[PDB]
Nucleic acid binder design. Structure first.
Lengths: 20, 175
RNA sequence: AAAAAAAAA
């Protein structure tokens, strides 16, 4: 559900990386 | 170990309502809503004791933040000693949470870092006030959570994540 | 801006 984006990677969605 | 604390209860939540809610997880030993001694006003929390520890775990895993009388319950394993709640060791604060984020969503995301003792998005009449707390069992889990999630965009809104600070401690540092 | 919690048996 919650979508995680990284501002220092141009706002790339990293939701799957964070979960593992 | 089969006793749950069930808090953030509406004042009018009864023992019967709690049995109806928790009963499907398995057979119940006893349920007590804690009350003021003389006025009997609910203290806003209860103990729910299952016969089987596996059943208590299922309920905690499965029924946390479910709504009773319009308010989401917050379930923990019972821990009557408040020293960890008081020390805040492992407890984190999150701010600028988009209003689309609820308790369950916050829990699911942060639990990637470690086992959570308790978490909460704060709400009022209008819903999420856009901040909350997550108390990890270990302080290493809290530290990873902060390092990883601070300054990240959560559903398109940038969050602050940092160690929780009590009101006194925070008003000290702000002056 | 924003900084929780728990008084059993």
């Amino acid at each position: 559900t919650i979508r995680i984006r990284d501002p220092n990677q141009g706002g790339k969605d990293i939701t799957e990386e964070i979960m593992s | 170990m089969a006793s749950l604390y069930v808090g953030d209860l509406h004042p009018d939540v009864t023992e019967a309502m709690l049995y109806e809610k928790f009963s499907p997880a398995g057979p119940i030993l006893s349920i007590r809503v804690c009350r003021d001694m003389i006025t009997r006003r609910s203290l806003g929390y209860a103990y729910v004791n299952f016969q089987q520890p596996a059943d208590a775990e299922r309920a905690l895993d499965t029924m946390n933040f479910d709504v009773i009388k319009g308010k989401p319950v917050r379930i923990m394993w019972s821990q009557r000693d408040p020293s960890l709640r008081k020390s805040g060791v492992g407890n984190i604060f999150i701010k600028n949470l988009d209003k689309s984020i609820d308790n369950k969503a916050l829990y699911d995301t942060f639990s990637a870092f470690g086992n959570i003792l308790s978490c909460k998005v704060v709400c009022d009449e209008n819903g999420s006030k856009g901040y909350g707390f997550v108390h990890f069992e270990t302080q290493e889990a809290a530290e990873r959570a902060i390092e990883k999630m601070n300054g990240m965009l959560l559903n398109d809104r940038k969050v602050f994540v940092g160690r929780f600070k009590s009101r006194k401690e925070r008003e000290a540092e702000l002056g």
